[model samples]
Target: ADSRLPNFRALTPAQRRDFLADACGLSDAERALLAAPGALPLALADGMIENVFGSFELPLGVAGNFRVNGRDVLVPMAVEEPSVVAAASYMAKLAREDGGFQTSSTLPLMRAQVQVLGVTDPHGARLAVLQARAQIIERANSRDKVLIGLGGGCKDIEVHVFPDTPRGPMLVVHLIVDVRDAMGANTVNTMAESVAPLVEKITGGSVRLRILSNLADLRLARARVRLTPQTLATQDRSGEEIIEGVLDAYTFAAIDPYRAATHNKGIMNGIDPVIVATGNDWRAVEAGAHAYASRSGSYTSLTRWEKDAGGALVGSIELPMPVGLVGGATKTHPLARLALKIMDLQSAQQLGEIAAAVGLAQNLGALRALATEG
Candidate 1:
């Protein structure tokens, strides 16, 4: 499908809606829902969150001209901030000159930690748990029959020893589980709780925290893009001049924490909107992303920018993307369901890949605009 919406920038919000409805084959009901102020009713609001305090609203917009991994995709974004959706669409348009965004991902493995405290020998406890890994994995796999039936379940175990800390010596047993198309927070959390007793018995120490880990390094998504000088050239300035300014801005972010925060924030400005649109847990995703970003113990840029041998700018980004295709808001929320349909998402990982690509595109757009604006 063609994603380009020519003259879209000149259209009013209502006109944009009508244009998307016609291009995407939106049913009358779906188009009406988009026009409705109460996309989420108060009756539904009472069920979705605590206390039924009321509902909040944000602008729902679609970024055009995104092609990921050789397929066209229109991106739906829900946000209150300005320029995010526009930047993504503009960058995606530029990217088409170099074949658009290339996307990839790792296994959908999620981590659940069993924290053992007051251990007399934390290192020894870690070893003991590792020795019993097979049995632990079996037990974790045993409970989730439906997930196992779908070719997903606990696959392995890892034991980490922190033998000394202010709180005391501790052992963290990690259950590495294949969550398939689901986010697997509760799935892995159940497995962690299911095997907590066995862990305590094996290590002879009490398990304090049997919960899911938000540092989702094991489940990563990646996106890469190449920008040609011709596509980047403006009427007043040469593309080469803009390229140098962008690279300089990138260097500043990489070297200084103050700039990195805003730089990375710009990336998230592109990501969180898509997450919210899809009805996924933005908080969990945010937690995982920030934790993964600081894994080096210091904040730094999540994107790597470099020029190719031909001197054309190339950019790439990889990060923790924990999203679900069939849970929470995706299935239950009305707008989220339609957002998924509009984006033509096929799976959870596909959604994550798209989000990562959007983020990279957003980053490049922000840098390009800042560099080129006289």
Candidate 2:
């Protein structure tokens, strides 16, 4: 499957659709679905959210020339922003000379926090929670039989005791869950709620907040890309000069929060569009990404760029990508279903890797431009 769609941007939308249909083996019905005025119907939109007014539309575009883990993929992006899809595609085209992108991911694990307050002995309460870890896990798993059947449920428990806060001493219990395919927010939240009573009993305190945590560092997606100077070379400047310029840009972002914020946003420009196009929660992924970026005590770039010993530009990124293929609007929304099919995604893990690769490519695109023109 050659993801390279030569001159894809020059083609009309209808031509692009037909080209994709032929490339991805889309049936006539699916073709029509993609061509529909609003892929999401008004009634479905009404049911998906509060307002019944109408269905808004965004330009859905596919970026070409992505090879992830030795497999070709056509990326779908839905965003009103200009130049994003083009930038990602162009960067990926250059990356193909170096075997495109390599990617990896952790298990689909998510964390749910159950906050217990008003405990007399926070340390003892934490120890007591640990003592009942086995049954507490069992109790949490009892609420979702299907998840357990699918080999995904509450797997472990972690207790974080805060000796003092503005409110007072507190204890936070973390439920580590394998959410499988679904984003697992509802699953983790339900399990957290189910186990709150036991947590309160163990801590001898009132349960305050039982909810899913968006900082899903455990469920991480990573990607790496290498670009040769020859491929990156322009008529005006050599690839080595461009690499040096990009390195300077990276250093600026590494040291300054203002620059790092914008640099990170460029990465998300590539990631969020895919999340939105695939009907996943872009907001959750965005939150997790920014939080992860600041995990090192200061806000910094989500991606790293440097000149390898070979003089080739090397770039990499690792971020929490808690996206799923099953629940939410993934299956229900027509275009989202089509987007997933276009990519031929095998699992949420693959999807996350793909998004991460795009993010890395997007960051390079921005850096290259800033180094050259800006």
Assess every candidate by TM-score.
0.97, 0.98
Show the colliding residue pairs in model 1: none
Which candidate has the top score in TM-score?
2
Q: Candidate 1 has what TM-score?
A: 0.97
lDDT of 1 by residue, 1-374 (tens): 77898898899989999988888889999999998788888887778888887788888888999999999899999899888888899999999998999999998989999999979898877888888889899988877899999888998888888888899988999999889988888898899999988988998899999988999999999999998788889899888888898899899888888999889999998899999998999998888887777888888889999999999999999999999888776777888988988888888899999999999999998999898877
Scanning candidate 1 in windows of ten residues, the lowest lDDT window is 325-334
Which segments of model 2 are wrong by more than 4 Å? none
lDDT of each: 0.89, 0.93
Per residue, candidate 2 scores C-alpha lDDT tens digits across 1-374 of: 87989787689999999999999999999999988697788888888889679877888899999999999999999999999999999999998998889999999999999999999799988888999999999999997898899899999999998898999998999999999988889989999999998888777899999999999999999999998899889999999999999999999999999999999999999999999999999999999999999999999999999889989999999999999999999988988988999999989989999999999999999999998993
